[PDB]
Amino acid sequence: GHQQLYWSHPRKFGQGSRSCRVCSNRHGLIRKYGLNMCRQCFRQYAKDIGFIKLD
Amino acid sequence: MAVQISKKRKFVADGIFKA
Amino acid sequence: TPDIKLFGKWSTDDVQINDISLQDYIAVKEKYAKYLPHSAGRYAAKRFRKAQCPIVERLTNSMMMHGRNNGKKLMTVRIVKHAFEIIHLLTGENPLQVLVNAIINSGPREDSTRIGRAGTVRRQAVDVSPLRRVNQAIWLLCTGAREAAFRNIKTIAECLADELINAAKGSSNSYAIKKKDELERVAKSNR
Amino acid sequence: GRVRTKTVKKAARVIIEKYYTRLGNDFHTNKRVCEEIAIIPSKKLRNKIAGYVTHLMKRIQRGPVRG
Amino acid sequence: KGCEVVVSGKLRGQRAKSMKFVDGLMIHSGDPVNYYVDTAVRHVLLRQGVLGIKVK
Amino acid sequence: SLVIPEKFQHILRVLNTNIDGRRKIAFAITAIKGVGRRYAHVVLRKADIDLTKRAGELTEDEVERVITIMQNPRQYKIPDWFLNRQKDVKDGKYSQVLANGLDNKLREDLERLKKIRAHRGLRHFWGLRVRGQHTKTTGRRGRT
Amino acid sequence: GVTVKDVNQQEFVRALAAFLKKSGKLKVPEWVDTVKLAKHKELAPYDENWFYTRAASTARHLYLRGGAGVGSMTKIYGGRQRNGVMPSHFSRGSKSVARRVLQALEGLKMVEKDQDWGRKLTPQGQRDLDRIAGQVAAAKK
Amino acid sequence: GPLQSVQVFGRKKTATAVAHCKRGNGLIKVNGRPLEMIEPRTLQYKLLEPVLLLGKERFAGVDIRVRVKGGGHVAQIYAIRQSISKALVAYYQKYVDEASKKEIKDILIQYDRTLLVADPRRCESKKFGGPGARARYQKSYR
Amino acid sequence: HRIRITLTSRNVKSLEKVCADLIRGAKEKNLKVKGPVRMPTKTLRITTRKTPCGEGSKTWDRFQMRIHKRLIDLHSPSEIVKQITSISIEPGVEVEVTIA
Amino acid sequence: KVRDKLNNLVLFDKATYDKLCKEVPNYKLITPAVVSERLKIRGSLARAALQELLSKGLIKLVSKHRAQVIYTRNTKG
RNA sequence: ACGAGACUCUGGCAUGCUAACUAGUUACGCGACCCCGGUCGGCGUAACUUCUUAGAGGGACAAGUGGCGUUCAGCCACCCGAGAUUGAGCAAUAACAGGUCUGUGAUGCCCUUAGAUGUCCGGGGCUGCACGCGCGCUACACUGACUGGCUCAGCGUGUGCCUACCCUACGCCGGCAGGCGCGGGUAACCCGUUGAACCCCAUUCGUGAUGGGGAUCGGGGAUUGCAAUUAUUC
């Protein structure tokens, strides 16, 4: 029953259900507008999305 | 299209593909 | 063309100021006549633009204090309306004049400011500008009203009103007269 | 304060030195002249330049100028 | 109209030291750095360690 | 209607407690444990009694009526959810439990928790917070 | 003539509550004696008959703006919720109380079921509202 | 004959008040309600400032319908008291000789400036590091 | 023939250029054309900490992305719209052809 | 230097009632607060006495408000 | 030559211009009601941009007047004017043994690597209390509390990729927390004309740790989830 015990923990919700698109990190994720990135890499790749800084 | 995501999601996804 | 500008029912005309020092710093007479103690604003953009403000609006502004009551203007308007009702009932004449006579009699004519270094309380007696005189008069009357209308059955309407009658002649039982006498005697002390 | 920059003052001095018979004391008229005969990348810079041109005219109409 | 190269990292030693190679004209403030200077940051994997490059 | 009457009750000896007579008839009965500012309105709402009267001027008939409403409420048209003691652990009898009744009920619930030896009973015996809150930097009134 | 907008609503709601009490046709429920009007209230309502005043306010609010259902009127008769140590927050009222008021005004001949999820006024209800507005205006003047 | 109608706005912070002046009998109402009954009742004379300041013979020839949206209460009251005066001045400019406009405008500016011009005061943006636009959070030492 | 064409882009200048190009094409077509309906601009706001750390002054940065939408109504079938919109398009703009 | 703990009466007495009924119309200022101060009377009771005296037609109302109410001596003319 | 300034965004205005049944206004007709007129976000259609939306232009420059000053740069007051110092963004050389190896398949060296200091599953802990400190929330009341009524906004977000989990109108049951069918929206179209609170009005309370304050504690009922004890929340 290893094949049914290795993934016996549900992952429908919680922090481990979410995963970062770029670095697979569970911390500092943004879920606004379906981005699913950490804050640091969103700051790094902020320019080519179209997000500009002018406020 | 049945799923039809929003205008903001289209631009965010297009930036994702460009990156 | 209205020949008189009532504050609802109280005439702004035929008032006389006994002090020539505060003639142009008290705004009641025929140019600064409204129908409410609630102005539009823009009176604190320059240095001396607050001198053109009506004195009922200045007391209305200085009534609200102490965090809980900040921002409440209409409530202060109806408090000073009921207060002027009490002045009219207890005296019989125009309550604008009692507001004029209380401000003159409660403004400190002398003051003591700090001098020198720290370590000893050394002060120098100086003169008081007439704008600071009416500012200290309004602040002392509002502070005395706040201290009287606290932890008592007496309402704010009477506790704004009956000190003005006591400050009209200086009956030695009001807050502003006592603190003005204290300021005058401590200014005479370090002279 | 309102103190003009070396760029505005230099451009106004050289536009007085090059052009003199096409200007005047009216601010809007020589503002339009300064828009036409030069390349200015902003409206505010154009207004500042035309204002210093008008001040230079008020200086020049009195007596000689050392610059 | 102008360019500059900055190389940072462990350059022939133990302490990290930066070499800056400036010439020409170069602005740094306001908006015009968006569309007059082009910035590219790269990492170089040497045997001794890492190295960073900024060219504008 | 506004002057004082005779036989005025000053101190009320009802349900072995003291009730001051100068307060309102709704809010002077709040000195009894088990009744507060919310149960006191409904006991005087089912009884045909005026609410604008002081508690000292009432008569024994209306006093006994209010006592019967607050003593046996369930058969006297009071909803079950409005009672404080619902689904008792011994028998499940719905009742508005009296002052010394709540004192005895509280001490026997503490004795039940102590004899069952639960986490709540252990924390009550030690004298600590039982609702599961942080007490590292708060609750300094324990001892010294 | 004179409408509801030409007279103050403060005396109007009391007069409409008195007239609707005098009609005696509201089929008021049985648990109105012991109920709280919202989840954020602290005590019972101090008035002996809150249901007639609530029904009058519901009728005149339906006159000013119709098409509102049960959940639309819960936003109206709600306010600040004091949670004690917490910072305060906005909270709605009781849905079933407003629903029973709407059923009462539908059973009485004032409120009909409006299309597209609303409840409008019968023109007899408009007749009653305008007539009592005229009576209150005549009593004031 | 042809209709003589003007439409004049008026704002204080964000509450706009658009007044519709046309030829008719003399009666003034906003949102279907007269000027005598608008809550709050404290600002009643402040609402009534143009009529008692200017005379009932000036408002006798027109009726006014005003539609509003935005703001709070005091801003709305100031929007009405600006919009009525500006609409009346615009109507007299449009259809009456200009001497009446001068004789109404000099006394209207003489009473208070904001009867004909708006207030250039809006809320500014709140910045990080504090609970307001100017205030900052408390700083702890040691 | 009530058709509604949406036109969205990041840019304003190229959006207005292609809108004016389609308008002057419809005017040279001698066809009844409606004007542009300037939709309200939606702004996407992201505020985050500049540092990757928890050390330093509490400083935040602001990110924006404006969205501009234009509408064009026309009175022609789909092939005329195709032959007028398939030529010389801006790379920032996008289209959506509908019929109602 | 003393608290002077107040124990205000909730209903009247034999001398207080006719004492105020002969005295308080002769005052120039009559408010429930001030008559509660000079007669040692609870806040609600002073209010109830003033609309009772208003219903008796011996006290003239000048202003009605939820916060402060002011009551006057009748004119001697 | 850099930095400052110059530059970008926003706010304040234009009854002039270009266009809006996914925003409206005014007229006209049909409706409902009061007494010859008034009201209605009720219905429909003859123009238009007053409100609203967002594009190009315009506008403010120490421009005019009176004083001060090497009549220098510049300063002050004032008329007319929506503004005669709006707020933010970007932000130079040189370095600090400043923080991050726990943001990264960014990383050198060192250590471990099957009885794993890698991985996965079940349970516990990060919450544990003589005490001290920092940022905060609630109040100490009657300029107030409780109960009804009155009436007023703007940034916004919303059915998801392996992502199951969205925002809610309407009708029913129940004190309330809450429960299935019922329809709309991939959005100025639907929640929504976001009936926000503080205010305003009318009673009740009366200086009493009281109807202030709601900490502590007992019982019961609900949703989320595989699971709530060391109460998740209500």
Rounded-to-10 torsion of CA D42, D43, D46, D50 = -170
Supply the DSSP symbol for G6.
G
- One-letter identity of residue G54: R
Is residue D52 a contact partner of residue D12, using CB atoms and an 8 Å limit?
A: yes
> What own/partner pairs with CB < 8 Å and gap ≥ 24 does H47-51 have?
H47/H77, H47/H80, H47/H81, H49/C35, H49/H81, H49/H111, H49/H115, H50/H81, H50/H84, H50/H85, H50/H88, H50/H108, H50/H115
Number of H helices, E strands in chain C: 6, 2
| Six token digits for residue D60 | 């020049």
Strand K–CB H18 distance below 7 A: yes
Is residue F56 a contact partner of residue J9, using CB atoms and an 8 Å limit?
A: no
Strand K–CB G107 distance below 7 A: no
Q: Where are the domains of chain F?
A: 1-79, 80-144
Q: Which of H78, H52, H45 is nearest to C4 (CA)?
A: H52
Q: Does H131 touch chain I (CB under 8 A)?
A: no
Q: In strand K, which positions have an atom below 7 A from any protein CB?
A: 1-9, 11-13, 15, 18-20, 22, 25-27, 32-35, 37-42, 50-56, 58-64, 71-75, 82-83, 86-95, 97-100, 103-104, 106-108, 120-122, 127-144, 146-165, 168-178, 186-188, 192-193, 195-208, 211, 213-221, 225-226, 229-232
Strand K–CB F54 distance below 7 A: no
Q: Which of G41, G34, G32 is nearest to F69 (CA)?
A: G34
Q: H27-30 and H62-69: which strand pairing?
A: parallel
Is residue I80 a contact partner of residue I2, using CB atoms and an 8 Å limit?
A: no
Interface F-J, measured as beta-carbon pairs within 8 A, has a size of 17
DSSP code string of H14-68: S-EEEEEEEES-SEEEETTEETTS-S-GGGHHHHHHHHHHH-TTTSTTEEEEEEE
- What span, in angstroms and rounded, lies between the C-alpha atoms of C160 and C144? 8
Distances (CA, A) of C170 to C22, C176, C179, G94: 18, 9, 11, 58
- What span, in angstroms and rounded, lies between the C-alpha atoms of F91 and H107? 85
| Six token digits for residue I22 | 């389609």
- What span, in angstroms and rounded, lies between the C-alpha atoms of F21 and F11? 6
Supply the DSSP symbol for J48.
H
- What span, in angstroms and rounded, lies between the C-alpha atoms of G20 and G27? 11
Supply the DSSP symbol for C111.
E
Is residue C40 a contact partner of residue C68, using CB atoms and an 8 Å limit?
A: no
Rounded-to-10 torsion of CA H73, H74, H75, H80 = 90
Residues ≥6 apart with Cβ < 8 Å to I10: A50, B11, I65, I66, I67, I68, I92
At J69, which helix (H) or strand (E)?
A: none
Is residue C111 a contact partner of residue C128, using CB atoms and an 8 Å limit?
A: yes
Specify the resolution in Å: 3.7
Q: Which of I98, I94, I93, I39 is nearest to I73 (CA)?
A: I98
Rg of chain B's alpha carbons, rounded to an integer? Answer: 9
Q: Which of F32, F6, F5, F4 is nearest to F18 (CA)?
A: F32
Q: Which residues pair with C57 in a beta bridge?
A: none
SS3 of residue G84 by DSSP: coil
For chain F, how many residues are written? 144
- One-letter identity of residue G108: L
Is residue I7 a contact partner of residue I67, using CB atoms and an 8 Å limit?
A: no
Rounded-to-10 torsion of CA H125, H128, H129, H132 = 20
Q: Which residues pair with H6 in a beta bridge?
A: H21
| Six token digits for residue H3 | 């209709």
Put simply, the answer to whether A50 touches B13 (Cβ < 8 Å) is: no
Is residue H47 a contact partner of residue H113, using CB atoms and an 8 Å limit?
A: no
SS3 of residue F129 by DSSP: coil
| Six token digits for residue G140 | 């004031």
Q: Does C8 touch chain H (CB under 8 A)?
A: yes
Supply the DSSP symbol for G115.
T
| Six token digits for residue G106 | 């539908």
Is residue J40 a contact partner of residue J12, using CB atoms and an 8 Å limit?
A: no
Distances (CA, A) of F72 to F50, F80, G44: 21, 12, 21
DSSP code string of E1-56: -EEEEEEEE--SSSS---EEEEEE----SSSGGGTS---EEEEEE-SS-EEEEEE-
Rg of chain C's alpha carbons, rounded to an integer? Answer: 17
Is residue C5 a contact partner of residue C35, using CB atoms and an 8 Å limit?
A: yes
Q: Where are the domains of chain G?
A: 1-141
- What span, in angstroms and rounded, lies between the C-alpha atoms of H78 and H17? 9
Q: Which of H25, H14, H35, H26 is nearest to H55 (CA)?
A: H26
SS3 of residue G123 by DSSP: helix
Phi, psi of E43 (to 5 degrees): -115, 135
**Which nucleotide is the nearest neighbour of G75, by CA and C1'?**
K195
Neighbours of chain J (3+ CB pairs under 8 A): C, F
Q: Which residues pair with E52 in a beta bridge?
A: E8, E43
In a domain, D1, yes or no: no
| Six token digits for residue C82 | 């009921």
Phi, psi of J9 (to 5 degrees): -70, 140
Put simply, the answer to whether A51 touches B19 (Cβ < 8 Å) is: no
Distances (CA, A) of G10 to C29, G7, G53, G57, H57: 38, 9, 11, 10, 32
Q: Which of H44, H91, H33, H22 is nearest to H67 (CA)?
A: H33
Is residue C142 a contact partner of residue C59, using CB atoms and an 8 Å limit?
A: yes
In a domain, D16, yes or no: yes
Domain C6-189 bears CATH identifier 1.10.455.10: yes
Domain interval for residue I39 = 1-100
- What span, in angstroms and rounded, lies between the C-alpha atoms of H119 and F30? 55
- What span, in angstroms and rounded, lies between the C-alpha atoms of F85 and F68? 18
- What span, in angstroms and rounded, lies between the C-alpha atoms of G95 and G118? 15
Residues ≥6 apart with Cβ < 8 Å to E31: none
Distance G69 CA to K181 C1' (A): 19
Distance C151 CA to K207 C1' (A): 6
Phi, psi of H130 (to 5 degrees): -170, 160
Q: Which of I76, I69, I48 is nearest to I60 (CA)?
A: I48
Cα torsion angle, D22, D28, D31, D32, sign = negative
**Which nucleotide is the nearest neighbour of H83, by CA and C1'?**
K50
Sequence-ordered strand ranges (E) for chain F: 11-14, 17-20
Reply yes or no: is the peptide bond before residue H40 cis, omega within 30 of 0. Answer: yes
Is residue F74 a contact partner of residue F80, using CB atoms and an 8 Å limit?
A: yes
CA-based nearest residue in chain H for residue C35 = H45
In the numeric block, the tokens 């209800």 are attached to: G125
Q: Which of G35, G36, G19, G47 is nearest to G125 (CA)?
A: G19
Is residue I48 a contact partner of residue I91, using CB atoms and an 8 Å limit?
A: no
| Residues 10-69 (G) near nucleic chain K, CB < 7 A | 10, 13, 31, 35-39, 41-47, 50, 53-54, 57, 60-61, 64-69
SS3 of residue F107 by DSSP: helix
Supply the DSSP symbol for C18.
S
Put simply, the answer to whether I48 touches A30 (Cβ < 8 Å) is: yes
Measure CB to CB from residue A33 to each of B8, B14, B19 and give the nearest one: B8
Q: Which residues pair with C113 in a beta bridge?
A: C124
- What span, in angstroms and rounded, lies between the C-alpha atoms of J57 and J62? 14
Q: Which residues pair with E30 in a beta bridge?
A: none
Count CB neighbours of J53 within 10 A: 17
CA-based nearest residue in chain G for residue F41 = G44
Number of structural domains chain D divides into:
1
Supply the DSSP symbol for C103.
H
- What span, in angstroms and rounded, lies between the C-alpha atoms of C123 and E4? 63
Rounded-to-10 torsion of CA G72, G78, G84, G88 = 70
| Six token digits for residue F69 | 């409403």
Q: Which of G47, G54, G44, G45 is nearest to G97 (CA)?
A: G54
For chain D, how many residues are written? 67
Is residue E39 a contact partner of residue E54, using CB atoms and an 8 Å limit?
A: yes
Q: Does F74 touch chain G (CB under 8 A)?
A: no
- What span, in angstroms and rounded, lies between the C-alpha atoms of A21 and F81? 52
Sequence-ordered strand ranges (E) for chain A: 29-30, 37-38
SS3 of residue I42 by DSSP: strand
Binding residues of A: 20, 23, 38, 41
Q: Where are the domains of chain A?
A: 1-55
Q: Which of C11, C14, C15, C5 is nearest to C101 (CA)?
A: C15
Q: Does I60 touch chain H (CB under 8 A)?
A: yes
Q: What share of chain J is helix, strand, coil (3-state, %, to 5)?
A: 45, 15, 40
Residues ≥6 apart with Cβ < 8 Å to G135: G15
Phi, psi of G123 (to 5 degrees): -60, -20
| Six token digits for residue D48 | 């500042």
Q: I60-63 and G118-121: which strand pairing?
A: unpaired
- What span, in angstroms and rounded, lies between the C-alpha atoms of J27 and J74? 10
Count CB neighbours of F17 within 10 A: 14
DSSP code string of F87-100: S-SSS---B---HH
Distances (CA, A) of B2 to A34, H102, I8, I100, J32: 18, 66, 21, 19, 73
Count CB neighbours of C26 within 10 A: 22
- What span, in angstroms and rounded, lies between the C-alpha atoms of G117 and D57? 75
Q: Which fold has domain J3-77?
A: Arc Repressor Mutant, subunit A (1.10.10)
Residues ≥6 apart with Cβ < 8 Å to F97: F34, F84, F85, F105
Cα torsion angle, F100, F104, F105, F106, sign = positive
- What span, in angstroms and rounded, lies between the C-alpha atoms of J76 and J74? 7
Cα torsion angle, D24, D29, D33, D34, sign = positive
Domain interval for residue D16 = 6-61
